[PDB]
Symmetry: D2
Subunit: 363 residues, 4 copies
């Protein structure tokens, strides 16, 4: 007996739309008890005051609890709900449902898709963006690796994380308790939480050594980055949820995952490199895409290939919204489909101005 | 007579930045008296309350007036200043300077780049988005065609237009004169002005017959569109400025212009088709690009290739900003350069959700 | 027979925050079976893509269903949920819970607070913003009056309404059945739905005669308006929910409601007039305020007291957001409390650029 | 000889609108050679990418240069141009023209309006938000104080300052020279620049002693604040421009200035205190207002009088824009006129969440 991971990319009409998942359950294509993780793009602003993330999670947990005959708390304690807000540009709201079954297939020669889930403890507000978050996330990434039955960190192609943020109220509550936070800015606290979580991935997978990580390097030393980490902050949770996605020889999945790294926001070559790494070597094989998952960010230099842009200066549109619109459009122009996962703010995720990109594809 | 058109794509540090144009004049590469048109991307929001367009026009007219020893009003009567606001995503602020001289070189056995300029009369607020603007623009397009020495409408590849819009103050002005405007929404009035101007192009070039155009069809009948029209609305002007760009046998330019039409916002094939129509058939020949000029818009269906997006539903970001970020990113991923011209809102400019795209290239 | 209305203004930490309402129920101060209506301010953008309204309604319906031992569908059929998004400026998110019980005490001398609730039938897309909605709302307002036991329309001080809007699917469905909608714009359909609902109130209360109302007058004739109507649009419902709030001789409530009409967005005199109409005649008595409820809008003239503003020209901030922030600030400067209900878009609710304002106060 | 200060509040139709000033000059009521300072509200977003400030300054300097027969550079060396962007809510765009004459008019009984102007040297990027800017501003405030013929710092009621900010290019320059900037964020650099300049005012006027000011206290110790300072950041200048406004015994002005300090954003009592300090003691005498000038900010506590708001959490609308809309709305409700000067970001200007407010009134 081995594991078989099935992945379903489901378009949504609204944050609370569960009809697509319900159709796959009522037809028997998805056993709801075998759902291990759901990764969504919700049509909020994707920043601090984005409540479509919790709206989407509450609706899915409410639906799965009534189908499984259990409580909502038991659902959210077992299944990872990672909602990335912000569907700018042509990016299509959707959810990606990860299902894991235990089938009895012979050990075929080769690595197939594997998935592992792990949660961290709740963090205090004054712990975000600091080593407490880095070390706790690294421990959970190793836990999710064994949950996915993956030994070689080279076989990990994507580590999706949902992490907390700071609000004005939580920063006030920390000041009243005599504590200091990593940054006094709610929007900027999302970057520190994403960066600390990303460095935790690189630490766990051996991508960077521990003697290089410190509080002063977080969101400062852009030479330190993971090539597979993908982290997203949200007001709706106080801990970190980790989804490790890779390939294992002890897998009966009809899917594989490959990945690459975009050097900048318009790096279309990395998109095709990630497709080839997933077994898709031509445009005619593009129908085997299950989903594309990528990180996007505005370069700290304020330029792309020596060309100035205003993402860091635009006070009307936060730069994470612009980055999502840009990279999603780039990926959409390559694969012919805008319904792909793009998350903004790639601190320590790929180089400065770039980010990891993975492709889940049929075989 | 023998015309030679030279085109300079100049990066800008701010809306009022004239240093790049001043350097090209002081080096002798540009005779300021031969400048006929300037097409700019300014880093305002590109909608109603975008004053970077007028800031850039005033700065350029003031500089050219002092260099030429003439008044600012004589400059704006002679040189077309078309400032398209909105540099979203990775799009780089810049201006494109068109210089036309009468050289004594033989007509190479082929059509080369030609440019023609024409202005319309000022419109009253109640004329925007109606037949008065359509017929007046149609006349100016023919006027600019003979300025470009282009007889066959088949040889016209891009018609850039700057047209007015409605503000709350101008709508009140029309009411106090007993007149009603085409729409009581300032942002939506830009669409009516862009569409009426675009229909004037299609009428002048024989793309649609006049018996099919009417007030009720403007911004309603999306079957009527020009394949080369590119219109941009602005608060800083009260008339329409026309720039006809094509190829003519009476041209000694070392440049040509080709074009295609994007069927939707992610139509990368149309970008490559426009490149091939301009003589670039491989990635290695892409260094011959002078500039790429394209229209972008949110499709009225709210979808791209059957995939929903929120451009028409996002009350925080107007859909013309989203469309500019998307199509510029797509073009940038193809040509490797985000410093290209993309204008949003393509009413009657290409199909619904698409727009014409032209490339000016060296030979 | 005898009614007692209790009103609780509860601050919320997020759209899904039910802790304040839960504390009042667990302490025994609120019997959840006696809740008849909940009027909330949710911290979404208050425009088209505001999902905090459904998020807040879903959370309250989910919580009350488990406390009452009934289904969520039965809760929304029993309790009126009117969620007004947009808490701009200093406006404090909160909910206002209306409790109506049947006590066995005689009606104290004078008229005391009375509340009545009624729902309309579901509307087809082609009926919104037209006479079908006006007459249907008018019927329900008259129905809710006797449910509140109010005979004299002079004793009605506030009519809060939640009304539907048009979406891309509902518009396309109407043309599929050979019908045309009042407007092809989702945001503008919210204004027509608010205006039609407001005209239904004025018709029911005898503020305007039926011979003056027609399809052409809806959102056109700003001389026709109600002085107590307060309407708010939302995507989460297909009918109109009506809350009539007034004073009745057959009431044992310890509260009363008075009201006035703001002639413009900065009409502080109207705020003080509404306070005295509710029995508060000095600054020292402001602690008797339970809540202040007001409508806000941008004047169609684009001016306030002869002074231009940019609300109708600002493409970065929707004008309904600006209007809510202004009137909330004006009320807060008078009562010393920014936690008051202010709803935007006051079509036929007060004069053009103004709106009704009511005060619920202790006696 | 004796000085006479005349102040003109002029409504504007656009950032580049000089028609109101031209009417007062063409009528002979204003001698353009006697203009010493112009304080404007321009309808840009009032944050980083607000180019209406430079647009207004360029348009006004260009106009006054042609009227005076001198160069534009000589005008900006002579006249203070302080353009504060952001006209949110109902706030009316306008400019305030300060004219100073040497008349032979009797010394009115009392101290009357006096104005003084002074400029600092240009600051290097590493000097913004630090003691170099504080000490340099303090000297210029003393220079403008004696320029206004004001001896007692108690007679200074308003010190308006325009200060620079940091851009990506200026940060690289400081980095290339081996220097570090106070903060690596363009938007937050406006706060540090505003705070350092404000502390320079308090230092110059003796409001706080020098031993309390340091680099670590800037934008941290909110107990240190000036009660008359009003600072505004802009990209269009590299130094600080200071306008000292007060009352002097050596003045023949028909005007006086009083002031108060708003304790929070809704402190209407402070508005009335500023009116009475300026000699306006009843509602009928508010027609003597020339202009009201105030600072606004979002309190770092995220609350107003114990009531939560979303200004520090709103990722769609910058909190300085919200603060301007609120405080302008509050002042408008008191004086009945939205055309008053309100500036956002009040670091070390009044208490945390408050700001100085001054009134210029006729006598
Ligand atoms: O993932 C991103 O695009 C940025 C983020 O952390 C917040 C979110 O997704 O809601
Ligand atoms: O009531 C308002 O403030 C505006 C509206 O109609 C939609 C909403 O409530 O979100
Ligand atoms: O003065 C303000 O309102 C805030 C600021 O510094 C930037 C500006 O003025 O544009
Ligand atoms: Ca990165
Ligand atoms: Ca089009
Ligand atoms: Ca109204
Ligand atoms: Ca302050």
């Amino acid at each position: 007996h081995m594991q078989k991971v099935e992945v379903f990319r489901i378009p949504t009409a609204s944050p609370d739309d569960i009809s697509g998942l319900a159709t796959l359950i009522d037809s028997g294509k998805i056993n709801p008890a075998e759902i291990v993780a759901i990764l969504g793009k919700t049509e909020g602003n994707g920043c601090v005051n984005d409540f479509t993330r919790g709206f989407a999670t509450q609706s899915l947990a409410m639906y799965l609890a009534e189908k499984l005959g259990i409580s909502r708390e038991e659902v959210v304690k077992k299944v990872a709900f990672i909602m990335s807000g912000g569907t700018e540009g042509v990016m299509t709201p959707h959810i990606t449902v990860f299902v894991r079954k235990d089938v009895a297939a012979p050990a075929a020669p080769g690595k197939r898709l594997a998935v592992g889930v792990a949660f961290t403890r709740d963090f205090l507000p004054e712990e975000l963006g600091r080593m407490e978050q880095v070390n706790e996330v690294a421990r959970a990434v190793k836990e999710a690796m064994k949950d996915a039955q993956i030994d070689d960190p080279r076989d990990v192609h994507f580590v999706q994380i949902k992490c907390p943020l700071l609000t004005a109220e939580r920063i006030e509550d920390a000041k009243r308790r005599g504590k200091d936070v990593v940054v006094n800015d709610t929007y900027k606290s999302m970057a520190y939480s994403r960066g600390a979580s990303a460095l935790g991935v690189a630490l766990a997978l051996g991508e960077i050594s521990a003697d290089k990580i410190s509080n002063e390097a977080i969101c400062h030393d852009w030479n330190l980055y993971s090539s597979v980490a993908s982290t997203s902050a949200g007001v709706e949770l106080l801990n970190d949820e980790i989804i490790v996605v890779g390939n294992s020889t002890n897998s009966a999945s009809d899917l594989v995952i490959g990945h690459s790294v975009m050097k900048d926001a318009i790096d279309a070559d990395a998109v095709r490199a990630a497709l080839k790494d997933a077994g898709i070597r031509s445009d005619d094989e593009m129908d085997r895409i299950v989903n594309v998952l990528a990180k996007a960010e505005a370069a700290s230099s304020g330029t792309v290939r020596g060309r100035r842009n205003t993402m860091l200066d635009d006070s009307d549109i936060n730069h994470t919204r612009s980055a999502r619109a840009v990279v999603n459009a780039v990926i959409a122009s390559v694969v012919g489909d805008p319904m792909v996962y793009v998350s903004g703010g790639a601190e320590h995720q790929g180089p400065d101005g770039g980010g990891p990109i993975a492709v889940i594809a049929r075989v």
